Coordinates of C-alpha atoms in Angstrom, one line a residue:
X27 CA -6.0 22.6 67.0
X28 CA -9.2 24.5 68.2
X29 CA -12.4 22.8 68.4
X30 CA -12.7 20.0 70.8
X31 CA -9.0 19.9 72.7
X32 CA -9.0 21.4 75.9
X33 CA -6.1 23.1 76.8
X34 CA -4.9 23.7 80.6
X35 CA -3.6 26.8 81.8
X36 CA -2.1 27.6 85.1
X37 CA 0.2 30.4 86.0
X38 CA 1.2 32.0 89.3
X39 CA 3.2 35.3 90.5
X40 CA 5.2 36.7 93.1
X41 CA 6.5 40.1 94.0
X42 CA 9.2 40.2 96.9
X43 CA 11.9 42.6 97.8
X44 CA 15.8 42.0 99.0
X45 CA 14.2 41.9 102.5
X46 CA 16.0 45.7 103.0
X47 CA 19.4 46.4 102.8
X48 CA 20.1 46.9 106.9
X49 CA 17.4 45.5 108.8
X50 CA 14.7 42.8 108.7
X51 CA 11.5 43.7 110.4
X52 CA 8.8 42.8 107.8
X53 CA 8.1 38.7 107.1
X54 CA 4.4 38.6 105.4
X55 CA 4.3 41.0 102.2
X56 CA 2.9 41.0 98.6
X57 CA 0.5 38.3 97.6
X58 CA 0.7 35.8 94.8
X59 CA -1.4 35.6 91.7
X60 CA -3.4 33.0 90.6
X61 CA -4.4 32.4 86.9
X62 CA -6.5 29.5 85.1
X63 CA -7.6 28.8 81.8
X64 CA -9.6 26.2 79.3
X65 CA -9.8 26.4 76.1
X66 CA -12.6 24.3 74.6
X67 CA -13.3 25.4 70.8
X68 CA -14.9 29.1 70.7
X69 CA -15.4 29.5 74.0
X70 CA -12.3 30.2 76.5
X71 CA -12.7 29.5 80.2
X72 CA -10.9 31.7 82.4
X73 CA -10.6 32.4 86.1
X74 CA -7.7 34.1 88.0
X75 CA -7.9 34.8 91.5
X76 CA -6.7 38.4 92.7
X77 CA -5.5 39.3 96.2
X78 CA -3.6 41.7 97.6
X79 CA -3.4 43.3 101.3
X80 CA -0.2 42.2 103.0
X81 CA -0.7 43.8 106.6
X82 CA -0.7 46.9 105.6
X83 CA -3.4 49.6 106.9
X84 CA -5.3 52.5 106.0
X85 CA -8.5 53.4 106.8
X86 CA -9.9 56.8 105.4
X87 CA -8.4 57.4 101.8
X88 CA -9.2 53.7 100.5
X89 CA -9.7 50.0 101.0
X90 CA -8.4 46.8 99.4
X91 CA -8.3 44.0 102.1
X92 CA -10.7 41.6 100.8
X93 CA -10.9 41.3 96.8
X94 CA -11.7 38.7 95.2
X95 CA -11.8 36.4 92.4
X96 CA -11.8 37.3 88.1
X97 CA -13.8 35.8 85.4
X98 CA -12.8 35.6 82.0
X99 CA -14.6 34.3 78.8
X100 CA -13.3 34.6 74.4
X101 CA -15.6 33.7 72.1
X102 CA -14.4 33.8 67.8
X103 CA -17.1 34.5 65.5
X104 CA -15.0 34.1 62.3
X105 CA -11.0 32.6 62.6
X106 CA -9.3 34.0 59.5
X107 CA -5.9 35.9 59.3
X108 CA -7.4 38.0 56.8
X109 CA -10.4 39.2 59.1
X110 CA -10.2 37.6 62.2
X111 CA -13.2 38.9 64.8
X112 CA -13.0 37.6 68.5
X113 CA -14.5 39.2 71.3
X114 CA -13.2 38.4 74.9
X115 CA -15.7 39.4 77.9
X116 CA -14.5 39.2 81.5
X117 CA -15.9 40.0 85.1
X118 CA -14.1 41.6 87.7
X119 CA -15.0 41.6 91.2
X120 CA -13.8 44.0 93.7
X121 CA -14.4 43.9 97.4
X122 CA -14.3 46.5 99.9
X123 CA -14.5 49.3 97.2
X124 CA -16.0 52.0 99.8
X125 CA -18.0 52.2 103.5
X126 CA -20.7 53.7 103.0
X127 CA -23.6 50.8 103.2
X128 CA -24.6 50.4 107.0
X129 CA -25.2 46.3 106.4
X130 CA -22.1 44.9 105.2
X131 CA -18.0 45.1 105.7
X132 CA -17.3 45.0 102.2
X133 CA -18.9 45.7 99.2
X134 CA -18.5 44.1 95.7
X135 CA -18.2 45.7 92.5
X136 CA -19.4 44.5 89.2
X137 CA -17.0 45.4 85.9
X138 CA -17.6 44.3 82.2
X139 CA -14.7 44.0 80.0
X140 CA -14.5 43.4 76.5
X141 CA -11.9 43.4 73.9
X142 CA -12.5 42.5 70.0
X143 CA -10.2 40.7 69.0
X144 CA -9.1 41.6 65.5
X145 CA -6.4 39.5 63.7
X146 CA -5.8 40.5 59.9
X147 CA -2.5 39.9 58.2
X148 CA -1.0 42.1 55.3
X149 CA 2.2 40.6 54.2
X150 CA 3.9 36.7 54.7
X151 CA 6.0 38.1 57.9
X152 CA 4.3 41.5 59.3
X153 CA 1.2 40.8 61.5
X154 CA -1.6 43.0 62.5
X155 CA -3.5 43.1 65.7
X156 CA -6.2 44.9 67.3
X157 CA -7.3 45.0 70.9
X158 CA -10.3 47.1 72.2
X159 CA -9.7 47.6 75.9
X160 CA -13.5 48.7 76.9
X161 CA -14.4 49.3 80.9
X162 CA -17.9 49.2 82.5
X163 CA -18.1 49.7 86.2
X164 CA -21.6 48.8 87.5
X165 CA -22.2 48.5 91.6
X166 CA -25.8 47.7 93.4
X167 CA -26.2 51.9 94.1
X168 CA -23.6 53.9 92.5
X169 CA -23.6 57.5 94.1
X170 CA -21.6 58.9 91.1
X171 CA -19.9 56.2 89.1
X172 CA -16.7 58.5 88.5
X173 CA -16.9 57.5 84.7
X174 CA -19.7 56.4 82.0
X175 CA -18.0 54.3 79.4
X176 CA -14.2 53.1 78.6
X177 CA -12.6 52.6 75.4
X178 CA -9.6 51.8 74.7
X179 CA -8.0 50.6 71.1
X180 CA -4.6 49.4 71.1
X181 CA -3.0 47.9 67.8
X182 CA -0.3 45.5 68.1
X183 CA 2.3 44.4 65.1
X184 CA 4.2 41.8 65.3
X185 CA 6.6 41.1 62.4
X186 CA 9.9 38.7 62.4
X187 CA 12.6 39.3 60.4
X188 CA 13.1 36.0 58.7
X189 CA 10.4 33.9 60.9
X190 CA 11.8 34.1 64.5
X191 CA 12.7 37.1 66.3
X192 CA 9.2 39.3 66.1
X193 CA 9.2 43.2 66.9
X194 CA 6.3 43.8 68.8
X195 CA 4.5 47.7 68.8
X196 CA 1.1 48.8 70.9
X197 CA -0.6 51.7 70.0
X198 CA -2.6 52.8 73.3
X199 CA -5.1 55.4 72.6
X200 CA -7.7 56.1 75.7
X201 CA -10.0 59.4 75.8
X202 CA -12.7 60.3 78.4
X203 CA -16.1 60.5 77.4
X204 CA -19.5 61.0 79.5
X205 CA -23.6 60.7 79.2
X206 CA -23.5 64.5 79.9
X207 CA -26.1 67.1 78.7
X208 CA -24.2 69.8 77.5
X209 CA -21.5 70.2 80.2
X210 CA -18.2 68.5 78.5
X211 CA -15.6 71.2 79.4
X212 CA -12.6 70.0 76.6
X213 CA -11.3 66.4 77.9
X214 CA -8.0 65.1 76.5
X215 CA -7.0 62.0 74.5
X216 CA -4.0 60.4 76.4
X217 CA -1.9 57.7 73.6
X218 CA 0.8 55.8 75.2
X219 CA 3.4 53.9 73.6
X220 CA 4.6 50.7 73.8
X221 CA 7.7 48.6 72.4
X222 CA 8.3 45.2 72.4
X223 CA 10.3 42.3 70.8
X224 CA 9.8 38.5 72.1
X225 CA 13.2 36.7 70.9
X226 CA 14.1 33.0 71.5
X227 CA 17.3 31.2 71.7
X228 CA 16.9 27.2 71.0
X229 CA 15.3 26.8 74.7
X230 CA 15.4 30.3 76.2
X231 CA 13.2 33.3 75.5
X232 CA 14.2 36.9 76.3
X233 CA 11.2 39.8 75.6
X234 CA 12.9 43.6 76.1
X235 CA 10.2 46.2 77.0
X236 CA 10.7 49.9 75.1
X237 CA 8.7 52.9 75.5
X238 CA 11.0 56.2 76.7
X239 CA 14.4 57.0 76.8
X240 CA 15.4 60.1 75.0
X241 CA 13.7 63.8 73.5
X242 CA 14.6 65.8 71.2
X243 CA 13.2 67.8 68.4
X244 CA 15.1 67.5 65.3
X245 CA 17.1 64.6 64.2
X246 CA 17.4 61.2 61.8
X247 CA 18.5 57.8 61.7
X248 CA 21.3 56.9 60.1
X249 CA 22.1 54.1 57.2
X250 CA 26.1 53.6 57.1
X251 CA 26.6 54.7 60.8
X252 CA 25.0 52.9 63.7
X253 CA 24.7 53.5 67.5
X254 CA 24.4 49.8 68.2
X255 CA 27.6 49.6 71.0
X256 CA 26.0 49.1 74.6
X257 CA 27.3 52.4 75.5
X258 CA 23.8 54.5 75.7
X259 CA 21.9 55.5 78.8
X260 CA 18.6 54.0 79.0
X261 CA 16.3 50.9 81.0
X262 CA 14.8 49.1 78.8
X263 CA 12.3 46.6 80.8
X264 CA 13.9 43.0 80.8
X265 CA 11.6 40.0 80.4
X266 CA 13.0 36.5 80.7
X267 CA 11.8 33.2 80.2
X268 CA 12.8 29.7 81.0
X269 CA 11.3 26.3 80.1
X270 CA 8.4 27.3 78.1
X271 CA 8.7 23.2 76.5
X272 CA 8.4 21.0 79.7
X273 CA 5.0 22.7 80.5
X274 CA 5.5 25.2 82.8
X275 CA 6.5 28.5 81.6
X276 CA 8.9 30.8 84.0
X277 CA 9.2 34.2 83.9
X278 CA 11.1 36.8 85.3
X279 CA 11.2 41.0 85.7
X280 CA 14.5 42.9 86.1
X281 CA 14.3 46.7 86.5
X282 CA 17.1 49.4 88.2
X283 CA 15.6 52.3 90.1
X284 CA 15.3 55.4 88.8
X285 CA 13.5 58.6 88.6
X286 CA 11.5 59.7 92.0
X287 CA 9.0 62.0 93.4
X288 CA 8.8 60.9 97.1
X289 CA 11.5 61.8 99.5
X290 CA 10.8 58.8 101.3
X291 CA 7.5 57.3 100.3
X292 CA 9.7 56.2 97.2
X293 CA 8.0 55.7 93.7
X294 CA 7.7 52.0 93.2
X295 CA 7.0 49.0 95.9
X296 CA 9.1 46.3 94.4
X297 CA 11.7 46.6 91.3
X298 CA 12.2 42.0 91.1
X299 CA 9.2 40.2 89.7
X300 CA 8.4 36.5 89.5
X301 CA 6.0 34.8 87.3
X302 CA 4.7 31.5 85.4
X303 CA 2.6 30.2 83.0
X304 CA 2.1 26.6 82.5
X305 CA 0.0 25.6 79.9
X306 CA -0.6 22.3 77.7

């Protein structure tokens, strides 16, 4: 199972548009996504390759043309669904970043990232996860460094029904923190929520994303009366996937538009996404 296997993994995305409603005038955009993985007993071999920079051009906010290629590496101290302990560290590289250095065009940046992995299981359906999203930026000057040290927790459940269709919930929780004196201010703690709920249908899967839709102040659910129709205004993110048994795994993104702030720069690039994972 895990010890001395070697699993491949390969996946690749895409992000393209309807080429505009009236009017074609744009050929080379978005870049693809490259991903790569080996698993070879407690150590996990990963390296994606990350690109983006279409023909697109700046020059004096930011800079993004070159990037680079990630690292990625999970080592399991102890594999128990009681008290699982993993610990996943990964290396980002970031070209460009920002002029400044009279020698060279573009400048890399070093980033740490680590992320416990904590598996421990409470009942014979309901699952318990735990995912410590920690960020280190580290560059060969650093004039400020923007931020000291990132941490993020994020606890995931996933619990079927009757071994099947699993309702997945992430609990984000990041806060600010610095190597200060005495000079804090009063930062914030931002939480995010996130919904989730991969199903499967014989050989199709189909994974819904929740977060937002509604506020109020007061109100409850109910037990005899339900609001299960398809009658209710609200996006919910639509993931599908095909194959996932020849080898490859295809996926897809599926979003309307809505809300905006722009009156013309528009709030999102792209609304269509296309992605796979092949892995065996």
């Amino acid at each position: 199972e895990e010890r001395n296997d070697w699993h491949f993994n390969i996946g690749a995305m895409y992000e393209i548009e309807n080429v505009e409603g009236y009017g074609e005038d744009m050929d080379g955009l978005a870049e693809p996504s490259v991903y790569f993985n080996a698993a070879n007993g407690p150590w996990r071999i990963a390296l994606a390759y990350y690109q983006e920079g279409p023909v697109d051009y700046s020059a004096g906010k930011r800079g993004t043309w070159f990037d680079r290629p990630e690292l990625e590496v999970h080592y399991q101290f102890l594999e128990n669904d009681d008290f699982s302990f993993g610990l996943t560290g990964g290396f980002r590289n970031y070209g460009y970043h920002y002029v400044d250095e009279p020698g060279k065009d573009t400048a890399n940046m070093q980033r740490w990232k680590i992320a416990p992995d904590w598996d421990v299981k409470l009942t014979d359906d309901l699952r318990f996860n735990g995912w410590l999203s920690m960020y280190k930026f580290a560059n060969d000057l650093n004039t400020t460094g923007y931020a000291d040290t990132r941490v993020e927790t994020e606890t995931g459940l996933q619990y079927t029904f009757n071994e099947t269709v699993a309702l997945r919930v992430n609990y984000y929780l990041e806060r600010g923190f610095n190597m200060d004196d005495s000079r804090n201010n009063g930062e914030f703690s931002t939480q995010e929520i996130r919904a989730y709920l991969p199903l499967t249908l014989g050989n199709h899967s189909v994974t819904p994303y929740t977060r937002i839709g509604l506020d109020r102040w007061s109100n409850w659910d109910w037990q005899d009366d339900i609001e299960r129709e398809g009658h209710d205004f609200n996006r919910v993110g639509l993931f599908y996937g095909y194959d996932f048994q020849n080898g490859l795994s295809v996926s897809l993104e599926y979003a309307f538009e809505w809300q905006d702030h722009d009156e013309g720069d528009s709030d999102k690039f792209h609304y269509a996404g296309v992605g796979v994972n092949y892995s065996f």
